Structure formats: C-alpha cells, structure tokens
Amino acid sequence: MQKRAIYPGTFDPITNGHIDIVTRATQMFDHVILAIAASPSKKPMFTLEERVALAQQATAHLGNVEVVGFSDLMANFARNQHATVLIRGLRAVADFEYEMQLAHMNRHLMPELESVFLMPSKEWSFISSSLVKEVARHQGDVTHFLPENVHQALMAKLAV
Amino acid sequence: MQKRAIYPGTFDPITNGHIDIVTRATQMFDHVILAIAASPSKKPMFTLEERVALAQQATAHLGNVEVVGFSDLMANFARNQHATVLIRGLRAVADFEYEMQLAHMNRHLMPELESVFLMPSKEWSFISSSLVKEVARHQGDVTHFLPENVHQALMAKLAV
Amino acid sequence: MQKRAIYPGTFDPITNGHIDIVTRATQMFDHVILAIAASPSKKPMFTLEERVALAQQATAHLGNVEVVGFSDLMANFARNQHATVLIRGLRAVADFEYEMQLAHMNRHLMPELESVFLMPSKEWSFISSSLVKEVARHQGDVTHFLPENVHQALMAKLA
Amino acid sequence: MQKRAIYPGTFDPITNGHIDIVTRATQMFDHVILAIAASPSKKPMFTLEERVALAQQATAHLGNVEVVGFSDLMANFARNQHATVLIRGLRAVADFEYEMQLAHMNRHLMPELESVFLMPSKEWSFISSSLVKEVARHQGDVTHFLPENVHQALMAKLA
Amino acid sequence: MQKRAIYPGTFDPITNGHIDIVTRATQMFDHVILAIAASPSKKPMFTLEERVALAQQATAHLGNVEVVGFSDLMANFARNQHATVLIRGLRAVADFEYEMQLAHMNRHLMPELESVFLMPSKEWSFISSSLVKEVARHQGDVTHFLPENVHQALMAKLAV
Amino acid sequence: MQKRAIYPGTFDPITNGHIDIVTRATQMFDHVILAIAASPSKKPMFTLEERVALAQQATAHLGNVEVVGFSDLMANFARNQHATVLIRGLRAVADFEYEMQLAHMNRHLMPELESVFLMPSKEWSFISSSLVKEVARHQGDVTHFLPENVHQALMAKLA
Numbered sequence: 001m002q003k004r005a006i007y008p009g010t011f012d013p014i015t016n017g018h019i020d021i022v023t024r025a026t027q028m029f030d031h032v033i034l035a036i037a038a039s040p041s042k043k044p045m046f047t048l049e050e051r052v053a054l055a056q057q058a059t060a061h062l063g064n065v066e067v068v069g070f071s072d073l074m075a076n077f078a079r080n081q082h083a084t085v086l087i088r089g090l091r092a093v094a095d096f097e098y099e100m101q102l103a104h105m106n107r108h109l110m111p112e113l114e115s116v117f118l119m120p121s122k123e124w125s126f127i128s129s130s131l132v133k134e135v136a137r138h139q140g141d142v143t144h145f146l147p148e149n150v151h152q153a154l155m156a157k158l159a160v
Numbered sequence: 161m162q163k164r165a166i167y168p169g170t171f172d173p174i175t176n177g178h179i180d181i182v183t184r185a186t187q188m189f190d191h192v193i194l195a196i197a198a199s200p201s202k203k204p205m206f207t208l209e210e211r212v213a214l215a216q217q218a219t220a221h222l223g224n225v226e227v228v229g230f231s232d233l234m235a236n237f238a239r240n241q242h243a244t245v246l247i248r249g250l251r252a253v254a255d256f257e258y259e260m261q262l263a264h265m266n267r268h269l270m271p272e273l274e275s276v277f278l279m280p281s282k283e284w285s286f287i288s289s290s291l292v293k294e295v296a297r298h299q300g301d302v303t304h305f306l307p308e309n310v311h312q313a314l315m316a317k318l319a320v
Numbered sequence: 321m322q323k324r325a326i327y328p329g330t331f332d333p334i335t336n337g338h339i340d341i342v343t344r345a346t347q348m349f350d351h352v353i354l355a356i357a358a359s360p361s362k363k364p365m366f367t368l369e370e371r372v373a374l375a376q377q378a379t380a381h382l383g384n385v386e387v388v389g390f391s392d393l394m395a396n397f398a399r400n401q402h403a404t405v406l407i408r409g410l411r412a413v414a415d416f417e418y419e420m421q422l423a424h425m426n427r428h429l430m431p432e433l434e435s436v437f438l439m440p441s442k443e444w445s446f447i448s449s450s451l452v453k454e455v456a457r458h459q460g461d462v463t464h465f466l467p468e469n470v471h472q473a474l475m476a477k478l479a
Numbered sequence: 480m481q482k483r484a485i486y487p488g489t490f491d492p493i494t495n496g497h498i499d500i501v502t503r504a505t506q507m508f509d510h511v512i513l514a515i516a517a518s519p520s521k522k523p524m525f526t527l528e529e530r531v532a533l534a535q536q537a538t539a540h541l542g543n544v545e546v547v548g549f550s551d552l553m554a555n556f557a558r559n560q561h562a563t564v565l566i567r568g569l570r571a572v573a574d575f576e577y578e579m580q581l582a583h584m585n586r587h588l589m590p591e592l593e594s595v596f597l598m599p600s601k602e603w604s605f606i607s608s609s610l611v612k613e614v615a616r617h618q619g620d621v622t623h624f625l626p627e628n629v630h631q632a633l634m635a636k637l638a
Numbered sequence: 639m640q641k642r643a644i645y646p647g648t649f650d651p652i653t654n655g656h657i658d659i660v661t662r663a664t665q666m667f668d669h670v671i672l673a674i675a676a677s678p679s680k681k682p683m684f685t686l687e688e689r690v691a692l693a694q695q696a697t698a699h700l701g702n703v704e705v706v707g708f709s710d711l712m713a714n715f716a717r718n719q720h721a722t723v724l725i726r727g728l729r730a731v732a733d734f735e736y737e738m739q740l741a742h743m744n745r746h747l748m749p750e751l752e753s754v755f756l757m758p759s760k761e762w763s764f765i766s767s768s769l770v771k772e773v774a775r776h777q778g779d780v781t782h783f784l785p786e787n788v789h790q791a792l793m794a795k796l797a798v
Numbered sequence: 799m800q801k802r803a804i805y806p807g808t809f810d811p812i813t814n815g816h817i818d819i820v821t822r823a824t825q826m827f828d829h830v831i832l833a834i835a836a837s838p839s840k841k842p843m844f845t846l847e848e849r850v851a852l853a854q855q856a857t858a859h860l861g862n863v864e865v866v867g868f869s870d871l872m873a874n875f876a877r878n879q880h881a882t883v884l885i886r887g888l889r890a891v892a893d894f895e896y897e898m899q900l901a902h903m904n905r906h907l908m909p910e911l912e913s914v915f916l917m918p919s920k921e922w923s924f925i926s927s928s929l930v931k932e933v934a935r936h937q938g939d940v941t942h943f944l945p946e947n948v949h950q951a952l953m954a955k956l957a
C-alpha cells in the first residue's frame with residue numbers, strides 16, 4: 001500500500017509537539033502532507049507565509065513530508081491530495097469530545113478518509129501553541145518547546 | 161399532573177439534534193415551550209426573527225410545542241411561563257461540567273424548577289450548531305443534520 | 321397525563337442521594353416505581369428483601385412511590401410496569417459516560433422508554449452506597465448520609 | 480510499505496465494534512494481526528480457543544487479517560509478529576485515560592512500536608463485550624451487536 | 639519552615655469560593671499573597687484598583703494575607719515574592735486538563751515552586767466569577783455567592 | 799510552623815511516582831507521615847509488613863519522613879498523628895473524580911484536615927502500582943519505575 005496522509009492544523013507556530021507527531025506519521029506512511037490553515041477563525045500570531053517557512057525549515061530533515069497551505073474544508077483538501085489518512089495529535093490535555101465531533105464530521109464528509117490519533121512524547125503532552133505564545137508574551141522561557149528557527153522567529157515577533 | 165416544560169437555547173440554527181430533544185420532551189410533558197434567546201453574548205448567524213420562524217416551521221408537526229423568544233434569565237422565563245421542568249439536551253460531546261454549573265445555579269434561582277437531561281439519538285450525538293455552521297461556511301455538506309427549511313435558509317445566508 | 325416512571329438500581333443501601341432523586345421524580349411524574357435489582361453479581365451487603373424493606377420505610381412519606389424488587393432485564397421490567405420514563409441520577413463525569421452506554425442500550429431494547437437524568441442536591445453530589453459502606457466498615461460516622469432506619473440497619477449488619 | 484499492525488485485546492466475545500476497528504485497520508495497513516489475550520485475570524466467558532475460532536470466522540471475509548492467541552507481554556508479542564503499529568479503539572473518555580497509560584508503557588517497552596487509535600462508527604460507539612454479555616445474561620436481544628456466529632455461540636454458552 | 643504562598647488569579651470579582659480557598663491556604667502557610675492580575679487577556683468587569691480594594695476588604699479579617707497586583711508571569715511573581723507554593727482552587731467543575739498544563743509549565747519556569755490544589759466547600763464547587771457576572775447581568779440573585787462589599791460593588795457597576 | 803502531613807495509600811508496591819509525591823510533600827511540610835493501609839479488600843501482592851519495610855528503605859534518604867501502617871479510618875488516623883494536611887497525588891481525570899468524593903468525605907469526618915493535591919513529574923504521570931505489577935507479571939522490564947529495593951522485591955515475589 002502506497003499511503004498518503006495529511007496532518008492539518010494552524011501551526012501558529014509549529015512546536016516540538018507537532019514535530020514529534022509528524023515524525024511518528026513519517027514512520028508509518030509513505031507520504032505526509034503537513035497542511036497549514038490559511039485563514040483560521042482567530043487571527044494567527046504568524047502570517048501564513050511565516051508559518052509555512054517555519055514548518056518547512058523544521059521538517060527539512062524528514063524526506064517524506066511536504067508542507068502545504070490550504071483554505072478549504074480539511075476533508076476537501078484530503079480528497080484533492082488523494083490522502084486516505086488524516087492525522088490528529090492526542091495530548092494528555094486534549095479536548096477528547098472535540099476530537100470525536102471532528103472525526104465523525106470528517107467521516108460524514110469523506111467516508112474513505114480515516115482519522116488516525118497519535119500520541120506525543122510525555123515531554124510535549126502538556127503544551128499547546130496557545131500556551132507557549134502566552135508564556136512567551138509574558139516574558140517566559142519557552143526555548144525547550146520549539147525548534148531553533150521558531151525560537152528565533154518568536155523572539156523577533158515579540159520584540160516589535 | 162398538567163406539566164409545563166421549557167427547552168431553552170440559542171437555536172442558531174435549529175438542527176435535527178434539537179428536533180430530536182424537543183420531540184422526546186413532547187412525549188413526556190403536556191406542554192413544551194421551545195425558548196429562543198433574543199440577545200446571546202455572541203452575535204448569532206441568524207436574527208431572532210429568523211431563528212423563531214425556522215423553529216416554528218420545523219416543529220409545526222408537534223401539537224404541544226410553542227416557540228417563544230426571551231431575553232431574561234432562563235429561570236425567570238420558566239417562572240413567568242409557569243413551567244416546572246427545564247429541558248437540557250446531553251450530547252456525547254457535552255460539557256458535563258458546564259451542565260452541572262448551570263443546573264445548580266438554576267436551582268438556586270428557582271428551586272421549584274427541575275432540570276431534566278435528555279439524550280439524543282446516536283445520529284446527532286456528535287454535532288452542534290457551531291460545528292454545522294463552520295462546516296457549511298467552509299463549503300461542506302450539512303444537509304443530513306438540518307430540517308429542509310433550515311437547509312434552505314442556511315444556503316441563502318451563506319450565498320450573500 | 322398518567323405518567324409512570326421507573327427508578328432502577330441496586331440501592332445497597334438506599335442513601336439520602338437516592339432519596340433526593342426519587343423525591344424530585346415524584347414531583348414530576350404521577351407514579352414512580354423504585355425498582356431494586358437482586359444484583360447478585362455485585363455481591364450486595366443487604367439481601368433483596370432487606371433492601372426493599374429499607375427503601376419502603378425510607379420512602380413511606382412519598383405517596384406516589386411504589387418499591388419493588390426485580391431480576392429482569394431493566395427495559396423488560398419498565399415495559400411490564402407500563403413505565404415510559406427511566407430515571408437515572410448523575411453525580412459526576414464517571415456516571416455520565418456509563419449512563420450514556422446504558423441509555424443507548426435501553427433505547428435499543430425499548431425505544432419508547434425515555435431515559436431522564438436528574439442531578440441531586442450539592443449535599444449528596446459526592447456520595448455513593450460503596451463510599452458510605454467503606455466509611456462505616458472503618459467505624460466512621462455516616463448518620464448524615466442515610467435515612468434513620470437505613471443507618472440503624474447498616475450498623476446492625478456490620479456489628 | 481509492507482506495514483504490519485497488531486490489534487490486541489480480550490475479545491470476549493468479538494463484537495461488531497471490534498469488527499469495525501479491525502476492518503478500518505485492514506484498509507490502512509498491509510497485514511493486521513488480531514491478537515487475542517488468554518487473559519485469565521479477567522475470568523473470561525469463552526476459552527481462548529473459542530475466542531480465536533469465533534474471531535477467525537467473523538473476520539474470514541477480510542483477506543489480510545490473521546487471528547492468533549497470546550499470553551505474552553503485548554509489546555513483546557508485537558516485536559515477535561514484526562509489527563510496528565499497535566491498534567487501539569477509542570469509544571469515549573474512559574478509554575482515552577487508560578489508553579494513554581497503556582500507550583506510554585508500551586512505548587517504554589518498544590519505542591519503535593507506534594500506538595494508533597481509531598474511532599468506531601457512531602453505531603458501535605456505546606457498546607462493549609461486558610455490556611453485551613450483561614444484556615444477554617438477562618435474556619435481552621443482542622443480535623444487532625454481534626456477528627451471526629458469535630451471537631449463536633453466546634446464546635449456547637448461556638443456555 | 640517559614641512558608642510563603644501565592645494565590646494568583648483575576649478575581650473579577652472575588653467570590654465566596656475564592657474566600658474559601660484563601661482561608662484554607664492561611665491555615666497551612668505562614669504568609670499568603672492573594673495576587674491579582676493587572677492586565678488579563680479578556681477585559682475585566684472591574685478595574686484593577688476596584689478588584690484590589692474589594693479583595694482587601696473581603697480578606698481584612700485574615701491576618702496573614704497580603705493583596706498585591708501583578709502584570710508578569712505568575713512564576714516570575716512567585717520568584718520575586720520568595721514564594722515556594724502556588725495555590726490553585728480545584729472546583730467540581732474545574733478544567734482539570736488546563737490545571738495540568740499550567741502546573742507543568744509553571745514547574746518548567748520555576749522548578750522550586752510547587753503547585754498546591756485545594757478544594758472549596760461543596761457550597762462553592764459549582765460557581766465561577768464568569769457565571770456570577772452572567773447571572774447578575776441578566777437580573778438574577780447572586781447575593782449568596784459574594785462577600786457583602788462585592789455584592790454592593792456589583793449592584794453599583796450594573797446600575798450604570 | 800510545626801506542620802504535619804499524612805500521605806495515605808496502599809503502596810503495593812511503592813513506585814517512583816509515590817516517591818516523587820512524598821519528596822514534594824517533605825519540601826513543603828515539617829514532618830510527613832507516609833501511611834500504608836493494611837487494605838485487605840484490594841487483596842495486595844505484598845503484606846503490610848513488607849510494604850512498610852520497602853517504603854522505609856525507599857524513603858530513608860528523606861529525613862522528615864516517617865513510615866507507618868494503619869487499618870483505621872484515614873481521617874481518624876490523621877487526627878491521631880496530629881496531622882492537619884492530607885496529601886493526595888493527581889495523575890489524571892480518573893484520580894480527580896474519586897479524589898473529590900474522598901476529600902469531601904474526609905472533610906465531613908475531620909473539617910480541620912485539609913486535603914492537598916500534588917502533581918507528579920511528567921515522567922511518572924502515567925504509572926500506577928497496578929500497571930507496574932501487570933507488566934512485571936508478563937516479564938516486562940519495570941526497573942525504570944521502582945526504587946532498586948522495591949524492584950528486587952517485586953522480582954522475588956513473582957519468581
């Protein structure tokens with residue numbers, strides 16, 4: 001089987017938790033599309049061009065990952081990319097109820113698309129991009145949670 | 161016993177999940193008031209006049225339902241309507257903690273009003289008006305989750 | 321409109337939390353059947369005959385309650401009692417998850433039987449028959465959580 | 480890319496919910512090992528030989544499934560089956576909490592074995608082998624939840 | 639041991655639930671700093687000066703409480719106050735997942751600071767400042783949940 | 799200010815997660831009593847005398863810890879130890895729900911005894927004595943989760 005999977009999200013910014021999930025996905029599937037939402041409901045800290053560049057640099061060492069921006073329904077994107085697996089990261093702090101709503105709705109929209117839940121290292125099980133951004137805005141040390149390029153970009157963003 | 165019950169909410173828009181709960185309520189209580197919030201904290205997609213007309217058309221086949229708009233505390237509304245039962249729908253994806261907060265506060269405000277939790281069909285256990293609206297805004301098929309009149313109204317709203 | 325509800329459980333023994341739920345049910349429905357499961361699988365402390373007698377005495381002040389024992393499938397028992405409402409009490413999330421499985425299975429077995437969930441007073445939101453028995457087994461005071469007749473029966477059983 | 484997955488459990492007996500999960504697994508991976516635990520600690524209704532025969536008949540229509548019994552540590556069994564994916568099914572929050580503990584322990588024992596969680600159809604989201612057995616023990620109809628061969632075996636065991 | 643603890647939050651306004659938690663904290667620790675967030679993400683109903691005055695009057699009977707405003711990371715505040723305990727109130731309706739995220743992040747920022755979770759009376763286990771404010775805005779009786787000074791201040795605020 | 803805390807449990811056997819919690823407690827309070835329940839109802843693997851000896855050796859490096867066994871109601875034991883704090887560890891939501899019931903009951907029995915909940919390191923957030931015993935029963939490596947003395951005792955018990 002030549003399996004194609006999508007890993008959708010806002011990635012605002014990509015963290016070590018997201019890196020852990022996409023790395024695990026690359027070990028089980030032939031091709032992984034890290035799919036970045038162009039226009040989320042909440043205005044992102046980083047623009048789409050910034051989010052894409054940061055994710056590309058942070059996943060450049062993974063040969064079977066492609067980073068792509070999208071603005072449509074994640075099921076419509078998977079359909080157009082010929083993907084049959086949608087990857088979701090399940091943290092210790094996940095909103096399990098929302099993950100159930102999302103998976104059942106995604107199955108209604110594209111029944112041939114299977115939702116696959118992967119668990120990150122215990123190291124990243126208790127973080128989110130929102131939490132990292134709030135800590136960094138309040139002058140806290142978040143270096144451990146980010147790839148080096150993201151740490152540099154976040155410092156630059158908060159400086160101005 | 162001549163029991164009167166209220167079923168409050170925003171109904172923005174009314175879905176098949178809400179229809180399932182109000183239908184179950186009509187089988188156990190003599191009179192059910194489907195109570196639509198006039199001024200919710202978050203600006204609704206549909207105006208109160210639209211939400212009321214849609215709920216009336218979608219419940220017209222139920223002889224013991226009355227659709228009414230309200231702007232006061234739901235306990236104050238129940239009190240003025242001589243209702244002694246407040247219906248809440250409990251989904252598989254419900255925020256059980258919030259339902260507990262709400263029921264205990266409603267009991268403090270009107271101790272003679274009993275909160276009754278009803279469970280929808282498995283078919284509607286994983287949806288919400290918010291999720292349906294987000295899917296439809298992103299050009300997804302939500303026909304299965306709505307009464308026909310609501311499907312028509314939602315298409316018209318998103319077209320403009 | 322001649323509405324009959326059934327409130328099933330093990331009631332080993334009946335607590336003030338169960339009394340709170342059955343009282344709320346009697347204010348809503350014309351007739352409430354408090355249905356006590358023989359429940360041998362849970363190895364109960366009190367026999368079914370003891371549990372029925374204790375619940376009858378504890379609910380004697382409520383005119384529209386009838387206490388009965390059963391070993392049947394609960395949906396068949398509700399049908400045979402001409403009940404169209406099955407009452408369950410919700411204390412917390414642990415109750416909610418299992419109560420969803422049970423209610424969907426009861427719906428499959430009897431679609432016209434509606435499960436209705438009620439919430440107890442904050443006073444009894446954190447108690448169970450198991451917790452009360454564990455405290456009493458270790459000689460802790462449980463008079464606050466039980467009807468008088470039940471407390472004296474529990475003390476006698478452990479004596 | 481010659482991907483092998485293991486789907487371990489007690490399967491006492493295998494239900495339509497388990498069939499839903501193993502079917503989803505076969506559409507994703509080249510070969511799926513449905514691994515039935517001897518599980519004497521849970522005092523199962525069916526012997527391991529019975530559970531293996533029932534699951535083999537219930538999954539015979541799926542060409543890339545292999546049913547096997549085991550008493551080993553599940554991470555050692557996955558290694559010995561050359562599996563790099565361990566499939567688990569998630570019905571609700573109760574599953575999620577325990578499944579996190581299990582997956583972190585399996586990762587400690589075999590880091591290259593990835594736990595993959597799948598969600599069943601809404602149809603089977605509220606069932607378990609325990610619930611089905613409890614309904615059948617009380618003579619309730621469970622034909623909707625089990626493969627035909629399993630339903631007839633369950634009726635025979637309780638007869 | 640001469641222990642110093644902080645009890646941080648928005649306290650918008652302080653309720654009987656917060657009073658219950660700070661009272662329990664004063665019984666176990668030598669000094670408790672009730673720490674009020676100056677600039678929360680969401681605009682508060684009461685200004686910082688109002689929140690501080692209300693908390694001071696409501697805790698004046700507790701000899702070992704100090705009320706202080708802060709705008710920095712709660713871990714940075716604890717560090718500067720020489721506090722080694724951070725008090726969190728855990729309601730029946732708490733977002734346990736968020737409490738786990740927060741405690742693990744606080745431990746990353748200041749490992750010598752221990753998070754201590756205290757449980758309020760059953761009486762206040764189902765309320766929040768948000769719920770109290772929503773009920774009061776909709777003309778509901780919230781007197782039972784507040785200290786007298788807060789009840790007076792809330793009536794004045796909603797009148798204008 | 800001469801503050802005494804009690805940390806009660808079954809500790810069958812004591813794990814690195816329990817050691818993490820008792821260590822955090824010793825940094826907060828002047829004296830900590832690690833209280834081991836005889837707990838015959840849970841049919842423990844180790845006798846109470848074994849559990850006390852293992853915990854004493856595992857906590858010998860902490861100067862303000864005292865290990866003791868008890869069969870009493872835990873609130874009565876805290877009173878008799880002159881403790882005003884009862885320490886409990888929180889790993890996840892499953893702990894939280896039951897810990898709320900327990901803490902409200904302990905408050906009813908001894909209002910001046912304050913329950914204090916502590917969270918372990920992420921390293922031990924997903925372990926329990928039951929999980930460690932299940933892995934060891936299936937010959938899986940549990941050296942990472944236990945003090946050296948406890949690991950050797952567990953291997954000997956299963957041998």
Ligand SMILES: Nc1ncnc2c1ncn2[C@@H]1O[C@H](COP(=O)(O)OP(=O)(O)OP(=O)(O)O)[C@@H](O)[C@H]1O
Nearest residue numbers: 009010011017018088089090120124127128129130
């Ligand atoms: N620390 C993490 N560990 C594992 N999975 C994660 C982690 N952070 C995010 N994910 C998952 O990755 C996907 C994309 O996440 P997303 O871009 O929304 O980041 P996020 O941290 O969830 O964002 P936000 O905090 O703004 O809600 C989702 O499946 C999400 O659950």
Ligand SMILES: Nc1ncnc2c1ncn2[C@@H]1O[C@H](COP(=O)(O)OP(=O)(O)OP(=O)(O)O)[C@@H](O)[C@H]1O
Nearest residue numbers: 169170171177178248249250280284287288289290
């Ligand atoms: N799918 C559904 N099944 C059962 N009950 C439902 C369903 N949707 C809503 N309810 C219940 O009906 C009542 C009114 O709901 P409301 O108008 O807020 O819709 P909603 O889907 O909860 O809205 P939103 O998604 O905007 O929060 C509440 O008791 C709610 O829990």
Ligand SMILES: Nc1ncnc2c1ncn2[C@@H]1O[C@H](COP(=O)(O)OP(=O)(O)OP(=O)(O)O)[C@@H](O)[C@H]1O
Nearest residue numbers: 329330331337338408409410440444447448449450
């Ligand atoms: N304190 C309580 N408040 C509200 N509902 C309750 C309470 N105790 C029990 N119930 C509910 O009453 C029904 C019958 O409960 P049951 O006989 O199992 O008692 P229980 O307290 O849960 O006993 P056990 O601890 O033995 O399981 C169930 O729906 C249960 O959730």
Ligand SMILES: Nc1ncnc2c1ncn2[C@@H]1O[C@H](COP(=O)(O)OP(=O)(O)OP(=O)(O)O)[C@@H](O)[C@H]1O
Nearest residue numbers: 488489490496497567568569599603606607608609
């Ligand atoms: N209805 C179902 N839908 C999805 N996954 C399921 C379902 N039933 C079981 N599973 C999952 O399949 C795996 C094996 O389950 P197992 O053999 O324990 O069956 P079970 O139904 O949970 O039985 P029991 O009730 O005896 O514990 C687990 O990951 C479990 O969560």
Ligand SMILES: Nc1ncnc2c1ncn2[C@@H]1O[C@H](COP(=O)(O)OP(=O)(O)OP(=O)(O)O)[C@@H](O)[C@H]1O
Nearest residue numbers: 647648649655656726727728758762765766767768
């Ligand atoms: N009723 C209460 N009982 C116990 N702890 C509480 C209560 N209300 C708040 N707390 C706790 O006190 C601290 C400060 O709370 P905060 O100022 O955010 O009030 P809040 O009620 O949580 O606010 P909001 O409703 O705006 O989110 C937190 O640890 C919080 O969990």
Ligand SMILES: Nc1ncnc2c1ncn2[C@@H]1O[C@H](COP(=O)(O)OP(=O)(O)OP(=O)(O)O)[C@@H](O)[C@H]1O
Nearest residue numbers: 807808809815816886887888918922925926927928
């Ligand atoms: N890994 C851990 N991290 C934090 N707290 C823990 C951990 N293990 C146990 N605790 C807590 O320590 C106390 C005593 O626990 P107990 O002796 O029951 O151990 P346990 O690991 O839960 O054992 P069992 O699996 O046998 O129930 C409880 O408050 C429990 O929640």
Ligand SMILES: CC1=Nc2nc(N[C@H](CC#N)c3cccc(Cl)c3)nn2C(=O)C1
Nearest residue numbers: 008009037038039040071072073074294
């Ligand atoms: C069942 C659903 N399918 C969905 N697809 C999208 N797509 C948008 C595309 C853009 N920008 C999006 C926005 C934010 C994050 C992500 Cl990952 C994706 N949203 N959406 C839902 O809310 C529900």
Ligand SMILES: CC1=Nc2nc(N[C@H](CC#N)c3cccc(Cl)c3)nn2C(=O)C1
Nearest residue numbers: 168169197198199200231232233234772
């Ligand atoms: C204990 C509570 N009682 C309450 N009553 C109301 N009423 C408003 C009326 C309007 N518009 C409302 C707004 C949105 C949805 C609904 Cl269902 C009702 N809100 N409210 C609370 O937030 C809490």
Ligand SMILES: CC1=Nc2nc(N[C@H](CC#N)c3cccc(Cl)c3)nn2C(=O)C1
Nearest residue numbers: 328329357358359391392393394425613
């Ligand atoms: C869908 C279900 N229907 C069911 N009916 C019964 N009946 C027994 C009767 C006896 N003894 C019982 C046992 C314990 C408590 C109660 Cl309330 C009822 N059990 N059961 C289930 O477990 C599931």
Ligand SMILES: CC1=Nc2nc(N[C@H](CC#N)c3cccc(Cl)c3)nn2C(=O)C1
Nearest residue numbers: 487488516517518550551552553584932
């Ligand atoms: C991290 C773990 N690894 C484990 N391996 C096994 N193996 C037994 C084999 C037998 N009988 C088993 C028993 C019941 C169900 C299953 Cl799926 C597997 N148990 N176990 C754990 O409890 C934890």
Ligand SMILES: CC1=Nc2nc(N[C@H](CC#N)c3cccc(Cl)c3)nn2C(=O)C1
Nearest residue numbers: 134646647675676677678709710711712
């Ligand atoms: C790990 C974290 N540490 C944090 N410290 C702060 N401090 C601000 C200070 C101000 N204004 C604050 C805002 C609102 C309530 C409180 Cl209690 C504290 N926020 N914050 C996080 O969001 C996460």
Ligand SMILES: CC1=Nc2nc(N[C@H](CC#N)c3cccc(Cl)c3)nn2C(=O)C1
Nearest residue numbers: 454806807835836837869870871872903
């Ligand atoms: C409010 C409660 N108080 C309680 N005290 C005890 N004591 C026994 C003593 C023995 N053996 C025990 C058993 C197992 C673990 C512990 Cl930590 C303590 N149990 N108990 C409850 O179950 C509830």
Ligand SMILES: [Mg+2]
Nearest residue numbers: 009010128129
């Ligand atoms: Mg996110």
Ligand SMILES: [Mg+2]
Nearest residue numbers: 169170288289
């Ligand atoms: Mg809603």
Ligand SMILES: [Mg+2]
Nearest residue numbers: 329330448449
């Ligand atoms: Mg029970």
Ligand SMILES: [Mg+2]
Nearest residue numbers: 488489607608
């Ligand atoms: Mg199972």
